[PDB]
Design a protein around this ligand. Structure first.
Ligand SMILES: CC(=O)N1CCN([C@H]2CCC[C@@H](NC(=O)c3cc4c(F)ccc(C)c4[nH]3)C2)CC1
Ligand SMILES: C[S@@+](CC[C@H](N)C(=O)[O-])C[C@H]1O[C@@H](n2cnc3c(N)ncnc32)[C@H](O)[C@@H]1O
Ligand SMILES: [Zn+2]
Ligand SMILES: [Zn+2]
Ligand SMILES: [Zn+2]
Length: 234
């Protein structure tokens, strides 16, 4: 299948013409951060010494990391903090590919260890009313793909028009990634993390959970032994 790299999405001109030759996915508005449609301290880690750096600054036992909170610039490890990954776009090396049946997908360019941050899932943040409106909007238009992720009560990310390359991650009944919900400046975000070692060339997948709506659920083509046959939480 045609591949491309995250850098390819930076040139919209080169992208729009790549898309017409189907060597790239359909155009969408690229964003490095979530957009609210309707508008809405620190850890006690011990500052590591610099030859200790040759131990993890803000590791397993960090008060913020334990609450899935990122540190700010005011972290007692300042620059050396390993818990600012979302903020520093410390994304994994991932390519975008055409799958047999699922549309476009993500694959690992290098071997990703377990428990590795992949990408933030970015989009427009909708309330429940905005969501329900859009689902019928999209259904009405006979859209083939759906890009919704539950963030919390009355907050659902919609990657349909605006997002980044996280929106290409396909669902699998038997996945190699999970979502983790992380707090950054008192604002909740969501990102993909490997749950095991993902060999280079491998498609990244996660187990999409989401309350079902309507009658015709999308069929799963994951090919897993334990395939539930349908996408959604049901
Ligand atoms: C009448 C009708 O045609 N339908 C009934 C309503 N249904 C949508 C209900 C709400 C959730 C929609 N699914 C997603 O948004 C979604 C899937 C997915 C995935 F498989 C991997 C990764 C992500 C981020 C994903 N998001 C399906 C569309 C079909
Ligand atoms: C967030 S998008 C994932 C990227 C999508 N392949 C694309 O080209 O934009 C989710 C959509 O991809 C498709 N998809 C994802 N996982 C799938 C699976 N296991 N089986 C079938 N279709 C899948 C469905 O159309 C679903 O609505
Ligand atoms: Zn810390
Ligand atoms: Zn820190
Ligand atoms: Zn499946």
């Amino acid at each position: 299948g045609p591949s491309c790299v995250m850098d390819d999405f930076r040139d919209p001109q080169r992208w729009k013409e790549c898309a017409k030759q189907g060597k790239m996915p359909c155009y969408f508005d690229l964003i490095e951060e979530n957009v609210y449609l309707t508008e809405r301290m620190q850890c006690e880690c011990t500052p590591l010494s610099k030859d200790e750096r040759a131990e993890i600054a803000c590791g397993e036992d960090c008060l913020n990391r334990l609450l899935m909170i990122e540190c700010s610039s005011r972290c007692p490890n300042g620059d050396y903090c390993s818990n600012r990954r979302f903020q520093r776009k410390q994304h994994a090396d991932v390519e975008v590919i055409l799958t047999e049946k699922k549309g476009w997908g993500l694959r690992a360019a290098k071997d990703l260890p377990s428990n590795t941050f992949v990408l933030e899932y970015c989009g427009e943040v909708l309330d429940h009313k905005e969501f329900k409106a859009r689902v019928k909007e999209y259904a009405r238009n006979k859209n083939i793909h759906y890009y919704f992720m539950a963030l919390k009560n009355d907050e659902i990310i919609d990657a349909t028009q605006k997002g980044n390359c996280s929106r290409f991650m396909n669902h699998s009944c038997e996945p190699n990634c999970e979502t983790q919900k992380w707090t950054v400046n008192g604002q909740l975000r969501v990102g993909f993390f490997t749950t095991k070692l993902v060999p280079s060339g491998s498609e990244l997948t996660f187990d999409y959970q989401f309350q079902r709506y309507g009658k015709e659920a999308q069929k799963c083509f994951c090919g897993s032994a334990n395939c539930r046959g349908y996408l959604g939480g049901e």
